[PDB]
Amino acid sequence: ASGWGITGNKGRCYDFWMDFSECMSHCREPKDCTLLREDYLECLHHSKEFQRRNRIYKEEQRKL
């Protein structure tokens, strides 16, 4: 969010956060582009990708 990266280049999630903030800067209702907020949040933690890989491993496991 701040934009100061650990390696000294940039926050990997800074561009997504700035896109979300720029959308919210001219959108009086948050529901119109909540997609960008979701993108920023799951860019921080990679929740959806990990869920998908968990589903893949479950499909592997059910073959037992």
Binding site: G5, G8, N9, K10, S21, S25, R28
Partner: protein, 85 residues
Amino acid sequence: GFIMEFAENLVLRLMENPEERDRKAREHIYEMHERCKKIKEMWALPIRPYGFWTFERHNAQLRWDPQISQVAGRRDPYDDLLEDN
């Protein structure tokens, strides 16, 4: 003269205009009710305004970061590579 001929008009001067009193009463009622409606409307305002973040004082970063994205420690890796030419 005598006492009563003067006390009469003295009391009459002491008393006020009733037409002025009635006009002031109906007026005061009118503006008091209008102001009552105004205050009732004012109490309906939510604590958080509809715009909020839309306000220019509540951004403070969309016009600060662009003049900072050139300093060292915030640049996209593909900025110093092709800046030489």
